[PDB]
Amino acid sequence: MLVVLMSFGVARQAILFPNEEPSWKLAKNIFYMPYWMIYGEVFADQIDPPCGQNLPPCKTGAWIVPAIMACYLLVANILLVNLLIAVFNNTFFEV
Amino acid sequence: LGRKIYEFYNAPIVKFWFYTLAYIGYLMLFNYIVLVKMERWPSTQEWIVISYIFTLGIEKMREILMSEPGKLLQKVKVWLQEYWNVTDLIAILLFSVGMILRLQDQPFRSDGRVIYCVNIIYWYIRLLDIFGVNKYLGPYVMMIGKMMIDMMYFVIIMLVVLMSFGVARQAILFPNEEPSWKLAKNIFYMPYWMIYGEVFADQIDPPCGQNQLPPCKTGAWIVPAIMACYLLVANILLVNLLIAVFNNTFFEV
Amino acid sequence: QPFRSDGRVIYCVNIIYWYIRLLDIFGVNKYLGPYVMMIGKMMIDMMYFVII
Ligand SMILES: CC(C)CCC[C@@H](C)[C@H]1CC[C@H]2[C@@H]3CC=C4C[C@@H](OC(=O)CCC(=O)O)CC[C@]4(C)[C@H]3CC[C@]12C
Ligand SMILES: CC(C)CCC[C@@H](C)[C@H]1CC[C@H]2[C@@H]3CC=C4C[C@@H](OC(=O)CCC(=O)O)CC[C@]4(C)[C@H]3CC[C@]12C
Ligand SMILES: CC(C)CCC[C@@H](C)[C@H]1CC[C@H]2[C@@H]3CC=C4C[C@@H](OC(=O)CCC(=O)O)CC[C@]4(C)[C@H]3CC[C@]12C
Ligand SMILES: CC(C)CCC[C@@H](C)[C@H]1CC[C@H]2[C@@H]3CC=C4C[C@@H](OC(=O)CCC(=O)O)CC[C@]4(C)[C@H]3CC[C@]12C
Ligand SMILES: CC(C)CCC[C@@H](C)[C@H]1CC[C@H]2[C@@H]3CC=C4C[C@@H](OC(=O)CCC(=O)O)CC[C@]4(C)[C@H]3CC[C@]12C
Ligand SMILES: CC(C)CCC[C@@H](C)[C@H]1CC[C@H]2[C@@H]3CC=C4C[C@@H](OC(=O)CCC(=O)O)CC[C@]4(C)[C@H]3CC[C@]12C
C-alpha cells in the first residue's frame, strides 16, 4: 500500500497545488486524504472541483488527478485488499 | 584495503545495496523536486535528478551494446523481450521530453511539470521490481502480477453495467441538453465512484417542484430503482465474484 | 407531448437491456465466456440473500 498510496499522494499534491514554498505540510497532504479513501470516503467534493466557469483558474491541465485516482482506487480498494482476503483465507487453515 | 575494498564492492549483494540505496535517494530527491516550485533555471536537486536519468539511459545503452549476440538487431530483440527494460526506455524517454519542455518558457513549463509528475508515478512502481530480493515479498508481487489478468475480466464486465446505468441516469435525469462532450464525462463520472463508497446522497432523489425546484423531468422516479439494482449488481454480484476468482487463482499462484 | 416525454423514458429503459445483451457477444471468447457462465450460477445464490 505504501508504495502505491505514496505514488498517488505525491502525484495529487503536485498536479493540483502547483506553486508552494517548501514546507512540512506537503508530506501531510500526501499522507492525508489518499489514505482515508481506502476506507470508504472518496472525498467527493474535493474531486473534480468545478473550474473556470463564471472561481480560481484551472491549476494546470489537471485532468490527470481524477483519472489516476480512479486507477488508484481500483488498484487499492479492489486488487490489493482482495489479495489480503485471499492470503488470509489460504493461510487460515494452515494456522 | 585494496583487496577488501575491491572484493567487497564487487560482491553482488553489496552492489545491490548500492543500487537500491541510490535509487531510494533518487526517489527522495525527485519527491522534493516535484513538490516544490520550480524557477526558470533548474535547481541543484533537479540537476542531480536529470543526471540520474541520463546516466541510467547511458547504462541501458551500455548493456544493449554489451549483450551476448553479435548482430545489433539481435541484441535489440534480446533487450525488448524483458518487460521492465522496455518500461525503462519509455519512461527515460518521457522524462527526456519533460526536460526539453521544462527548459523552455511558459506555457510549456506547466506541461513539463505535469510530465515530471507522470514520471513520479512510474518511478514509484519500479520499487516493485526493486522489492524482488525478499523471499517473502517476491511471491506477493508475482501474485499481483497473476491477479491482474483476472482484473481484466472484472473490469470489462463492470464497464457494461456502469455504462448501462450511466446512459440511463444521463438521459432520464437530464432531459434537454445540446450535443456536447460533457455527456461522456457525466456517463463515467457519477456512476463510478459509487462502487467504492460515496453514493452521492444529495445527488440521488432530489425533491422536485415544492417550496421551488424545477418540476422533475419526464419519469425520473425510475433512476433510484435502477440505481438500487446497479448497486446490488456491482457491489455484491461482481466484486464478490472477483473475491472468489482471486481465492481459487491465488491458491495455485 | 407529453407522450413525447414518456416516449423518451421507455427508449431509455431499453438501452439497459441492449447493453446487457453485449454479454452474449462476450460469451464467444475462450475466457470471458466462462466468466459470464459463473455469473448466472451465482445469481440464484443472491436470490436467497435478497429475501434474507
Ligand atoms: C516521502 C517522504 C518520506 C519524504 C518527503 C521529503 C520532503 C517532504 C521533506 C524532506 C526535506 C524537508 C524540508 C527540510 C527542511 C525544511 C526547512 C524549514 O524551514 C523553516 O522552517 C523556515 C525556513 C526559513 O524561513 O528560513 C521548512 C520545511 C523544510 C523546507 C522541509 C519541508 C519538507 C521536506 C522538503
Ligand atoms: C514508514 C511508515 C510506517 C511511517 C511513516 C511516518 C511518517 C510518514 C509521519 C510520522 C511523523 C509525521 C510528521 C509529524 C509532524 C509533522 C509536522 C507538521 O508541520 C507543522 O505542523 C509545521 C508547519 C505548519 O504548521 O505550517 C507537518 C507534518 C509532519 C512533518 C508529519 C509528516 C508525516 C510524518 C513524518
Ligand atoms: C470509468 C473509468 C475509466 C474512469 C474514467 C474517469 C475519467 C474519464 C473522467 C472522470 C472525471 C473526469 C473529469 C471531470 C471534470 C473535468 C473538468 C473539465 O474542466 C474544464 O472544462 C476546464 C475549463 C477551464 O479551462 O477553465 C475538463 C474535463 C474534466 C477534467 C474531466 C475529464 C474526464 C474525467 C477525468
Ligand atoms: C458510450 C460511449 C462509448 C460513446 C458515447 C458517444 C458520445 C458521448 C460522443 C460520440 C461522438 C461525440 C460527438 C462528436 C463531435 C461533436 C461536435 C461538437 O461540435 C461543436 O463543439 C461545435 C458545434 C457547433 O456549434 O456547430 C459537439 C459535440 C459532438 C456532437 C460530440 C458529442 C459527444 C459524442 C456524441
Ligand atoms: C475503456 C476504459 C478503460 C477507458 C475509457 C476512456 C475514455 C472513455 C475517457 C478517457 C478520456 C476521456 C475524455 C477526457 C476529456 C474530455 C473533455 C471534456 O470536454 C471539455 O472539458 C470541454 C467542454 C466543456 O467543458 O464545456 C468532456 C469529457 C471528455 C471528452 C472525456 C470523455 C471520456 C474519455 C474519452
Ligand atoms: C429491495 C431492494 C432490491 C430495493 C429497495 C429500494 C426501493 C424499493 C426504493 C429505493 C428508492 C425508491 C424510490 C425513490 C423515489 C421515488 C420517486 C417517487 O415519486 C415522487 O415522490 C413523486 C414526485 C415528487 O413529488 O417527488 C415515487 C417513488 C420512488 C420511485 C421510490 C420507489 C421505491 C424505491 C425504488
Burial class (CB in 10 A: 0-12, 13-18, 19+), B54: middle
In the reported structure, the alpha carbon of residue A29 is separated from the centroid of ligand 5 by a whole-number distance in angstroms of: 27
- Solving technique: cryo-EM
Q: Do residue C35 and residue B153 have CB atoms under 8 angstroms apart?
A: yes
Q: Pick A86's closest partner by Cβ from B31, B189, B247.
A: B247
Scored b (16 or more CB within 10 A) or e, C14-36 reads eebeebeeebeebeeeeebeebb
Q: Give which of A35, A31, A51, A33 is closest to A43, Cα–Cα.
A: A33
Ligand 1 centroid distance, CA of B190 (Å): 38
C-alpha cell at A81: 485488499
- Helix H, strand E, coil C: the string for chain B is CHHHHHHHCCCHHHHHHHHHHHHHHHHHHHHHHHCCCCCCCCCHHHHHHHHHHHHHHHHHHHHHHCCCCCCHHHHHHHHHHCHHHHHHHHHHHHHHHHHHHHCCCCCHHHHHHHHHHHHHHHHHHCHHHHCCCCCCCHHHHHHHHHHHHHHHHHHHHHHHHHHHHHHHHHHHHCCCCCCCCHHHHHHCCCCCHHHHCCCCCCCCCCCCCCCCCCCCCCCCCHHHHHHHHHHHHHHHHHHHHHHHHHHHHHHHC
- CA atoms A52, A58, A61, A62: torsion sign: negative
Report chain C's terminal Cα–Cα distance, integer Å: 43
Residue whose CB lies within 8 A of the most ligand 1 atoms, among A7, A24, A31, for a mutation test: A24
8 A C-beta contact, residue B146 and residue B249 = yes
Rounded to an integer, what is the distance from CA B173 to the centroid of its chain? 33
Angle separating helix axes B44-65 and B72-81, nearest 10 degrees: 120
Chain breaks in chain B (C to N over 2.5 A) after: 211
How far from B235 is each of B95, B96, B243, B253, CA to CA, in Å? 39, 42, 11, 26
For cell 464486465, the residue is B157
Query: What is the torsion angle, in degrees rounded to the nearest 10, for the CA atoms of residue B200, residue B205, residue B206 and residue B211?
Result: -150
Give the integer Cα–Cα distance in Å for B43 and B35: 13
The resolution in Å comes to: 4.0
Q: What is the DSSP string of chain A?
A: -HHHHHHHHHHHHHHT-------THHHHHHHSTTGGGGTT---TTTSS---S---PPP-SSTTHHHHHHHHHHHIIIIIIHHHHHHHHHHHHHH-
The DSSP output letter for C29 is: S
